[PDB]
């Protein structure tokens, strides 16, 4: 997250850290959202590679023991059938991970609330992006969870020539673009929490940013629109 600030300890209890094994060590690669005690929602491009993954819930400081973490393996990876690694702009950047065990819910670990199918947010709706991603373009990962106020940019405006043009589709959500705040590498797969009816719900899965950089004016962070995949999500969790 570029231009963010440290989040209150465990104030976004559904946020998870997706890590892979590198030799004998583990490294953070993406964010995610705990939607069930044994199911995680993240980005498809986060699990394209065949690596050993693990999920960490109740996390805050990646390099220190906060006394609230729970580590669990990933036993199954279900990527959306239409996902294309060579065309992220085609959408469908979403995947569900079945955990090897059910985590224990508490003050620091809670399920994320999903919106009702087809829900579209009005322009400039209040939302927050969270993650341990890069704090600067080509910079380094954050040690502690970061958050940044990132209001939405409606489709009509985001898909205009003065912004993303045709690169953005209706199955995505755009937020930010003030040239100061945004998502960045490492935030991918993470949530975009938006305030709706007095409650925070996960309306987006961080998908991509500009090649020119993370925080670029008129180039909002692009998110997979969760409300367009509710039936798919339900069908997967009801079968496996
Ligand atoms: Ca920690």
> For the residues of 61-102, what is the DSSP string, one character each?
BTTS--S--EEEEEEEEEE-TT--TT-GGG----EEEEESSP
To the query of whether residue 45 is one of the catalytic residues in this protein, the response is: yes
Resolution (A): 2.2
H-only helix segments in 81-219? 155-158
Experimental method of this PDB entry: X-ray
Question: Is there a catalytic annotation at residue 60?
Answer: no
State in Å: Cα 172 to ligand 1 middle: 32
Distance CA 195, CA 136 (A): 26
Domains and CATH numbers, the chain: 1-12+112-227 (2.40.10.10), 13-111+228-240 (2.40.10.10)
Kindly list the distances between the CA atom of residue 55 and the CA atoms of 176, 179, 216, in Å, as whole numbers in the listed order. 28, 32, 31
CA of 120 from ligand 1 middle (Å) equals 35
Is 188 one of the catalytic residues?
yes
Annotated binding-site residues read 59, 61, 64, 69
CB contact at 8 A, 218 and 159: no
- Gap from CA of 109 to ligand 1 centroid (Å): 13
């Amino acid at each position: 997250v570029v231009g963010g600030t440290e989040a209150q300890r465990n104030s976004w209890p559904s946020q998870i850290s997706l890590q892979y094994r590198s030799g004998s060590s583990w490294a953070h690669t993406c964010g995610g959202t705990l939607i069930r005690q044994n199911w995680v929602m993240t980005a498809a491009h986060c699990v394209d590679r065949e690596l050993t993954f693990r999920v960490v819930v109740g996390e805050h400081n990646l390099n220190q023991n906060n006394g609230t973490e729970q580590y669990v393996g990933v036993q199954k990876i279900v990527v959306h059938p239409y996902w294309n690694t060579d065309d992220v702009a085609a959408g469908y950047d979403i995947a569900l991970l079945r955990l090897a065990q059910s985590v224990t819910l508490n003050s620091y670990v809670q399920l994320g609330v999903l919106p009702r199918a087809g829900t579209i947010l009005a322009n400039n709706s209040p939302c927050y992006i969270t993650g341990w991603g890069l704090t600067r373009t080509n910079g380094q990962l954050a040690q502690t969870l970061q958050q940044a106020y990132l209001p939405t940019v409606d489709y009509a405006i985001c898909s205009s020539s003065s912004y993303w043009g045709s690169t953005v589709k209706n199955s995505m959500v755009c937020a930010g673009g003030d040239g100061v705040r945004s998502g960045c590498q490492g935030d991918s797969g993470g949530p975009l929490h938006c305030l709706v009816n007095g409650q925070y719900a996960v309306h987006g899965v961080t998908s991509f940013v500009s090649r020119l950089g993370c925080n670029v004016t008129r180039k909002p962070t692009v998110f997979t629109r969760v409300s367009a995949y509710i039936s798919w999500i339900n069908n997967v969790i009801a079968s496996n």
